[PDB]
């Protein structure tokens, strides 16, 4: 089970713009990097999984849910 | 090239083993980022004197013609006019480094350090043999070189009035190779592409998840969009290291401290470039960025993936590395600068 500062760094690969979100920019980015070219449907499905709250990004403590599965 | 403009210079780092850093820096697409070398440490380096481990406590001497070396008596060290207490501590350190493989090796120096030495003011002048300095400690200590038979030159020394001179002997390889200072590596930042197969060898087995899926399920997709959000967790994961740091690494029987998978390569295809030139390992042990006794060390001369270099403040750090982070790069800072209020984050900063 990952520590919180270990949760954090994590997100920071993510969080790629500084501010404390993860924007469905930002994760097409990282999937492509990691070799998942998606489409922008495919993202913002990948991203409406992670998003318990709605509004339309992944903040840190939705992150912490999405890294414990 | 051989170096390219003034922060090359600066850096301390001789210049064909930085050619070689420059190369790896474009081959793994990494930015790497080093403390500043002492000036005394480069010509030693380049000709090939050893380069010292974590374990090695002992301090190394900035004068006489021990300048870059690393003495066996601390009294020739930096440490020369230090209390008792310090010159006794220093003495310790000595004999537990040579009780832990390390060799007391009679100190002889090639011809050019010698001219280097010289040039640089560390020797100002000799009698063909006798030396002379104005650092104090040629007023506790007289020293002379002889050459030797292989064209090096064996430093002795005595204690003002203790009639007879004696090797100064310098702490080495358990080869017997003298040690001089490594080259301390402050920060690395990988592209996040160096991590497609970590992630897949985690979460798949080396497959894309269009293959993985295709081979094990059959003729939405949430199985799909989960297996993805397991690649990206893998990756990133991969990317800062986390289980890779939560030990420690070692070389044959070195402890090379706290280092990621990706790390080593680096740390591996930089010692390789070295020794391609006529250099020794020179890159000894992780970044800065997992060291529990972090530094403040002002000036980071930082080689971009693309082969430019340059010295940053840290200032210019913290910019340096938002505008890379924005190009893919990633990085995770010394857990313990949160804490003394020296982030080079401007996020939330926690959970
Ligand atoms: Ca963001
Ligand atoms: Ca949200």
Redesign the pocket.
């Known amino acids: 089970t990952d520590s919180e500062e270990e949760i954090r760094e994590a997100f920071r690969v993510?969080?790629?713009?500084?501010?404390?979100?993860?924007?469905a920019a930002?994760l097409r980015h990282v999937m492509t990097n990691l070799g998942e070219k998606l489409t922008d449907e495919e993202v913002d499905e990948m991203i409406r999984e992670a998003d318990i709250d709605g509004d339309g990004?992944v903040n840190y403590e939705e992150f912490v849910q999405m890294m414990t599965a | 090239a051989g170096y390219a403009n003034a922060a090359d210079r600066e850096s301390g780092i001789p210049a064909a083993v930085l050619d070689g850093i420059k190369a790896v820096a474009k081959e793994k697409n990494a930015t790497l980022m080093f403390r500043l070398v002492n000036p005394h440490s480069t010509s030693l380096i380049a000709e090939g004197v050893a380069t010292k481990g974590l374990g090695v406590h002992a301090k190394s001497s900035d004068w006489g013609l021990q300048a870059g070396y690393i003495p066996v008596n601390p009294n020739l060290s930096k440490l020369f006019g230090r209390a008792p207490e310090v010159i006794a501590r220093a003495d310790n350190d000595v004999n537990s480094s040579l009780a832990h493989g390390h060799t007391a090796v009679d100190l002889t120096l090639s011809k050019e350090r010698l001219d280097y030495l010289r040039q640089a003011g560390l020797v100002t002048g000799m009698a063909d043999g006798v030396v002379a300095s104005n650092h104090a400690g040629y007023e506790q200590f007289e020293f002379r070189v002889k050459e030797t038979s292989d064209g090096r030159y064996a430093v002795q020394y005595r204690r003002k009035g203790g009639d007879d001179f004696e090797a100064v002997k310098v702490i080495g390889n358990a080869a017997g190779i003298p040690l001089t200072a490594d080259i301390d590596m402050f920060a690395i930042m990988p592209h996040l592409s160096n991590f497609r197969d970590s992630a897949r060898s985690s979460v798949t087995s080396g497959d894309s998840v269009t293959d993985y899926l295709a081979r094990t399920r059959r003729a939405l997709d949430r199985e799909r969009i989960d297996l993805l959000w397991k690649i990206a967790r893998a990756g990133a994961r991969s990317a800062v290291g986390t289980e890779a740091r939560r030990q420690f690494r070692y070389d044959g029987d070195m402890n090379i401290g706290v280092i990621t998978d990706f790390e080593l390569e680096v740390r591996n295809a930089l010692n390789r470039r070295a020794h391609a030139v006529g250099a020794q390992d020179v890159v000894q042990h992780g970044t800065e960025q997992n060291n529990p006794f972090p530094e403040a060390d002002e000036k980071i001369f930082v080689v971009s993936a693309t082969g430019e270099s340059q010295m940053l403040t840290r200032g210019q750090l913290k910019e340096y590395i938002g505008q890379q982070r924005g190009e893919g790069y990633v990085f995770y800072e010394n857990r313990a600068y949160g804490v003394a209020g020296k982030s080079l984050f401007d996020?939330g900063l926690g959970a």
């Not at chain 1, 993510?14 to 924007?23: A, E, L, R, T, V």
């Open positions: 993510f969080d790629k713009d500084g501010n404390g979100y993860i924007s930002e990004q | 996020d």
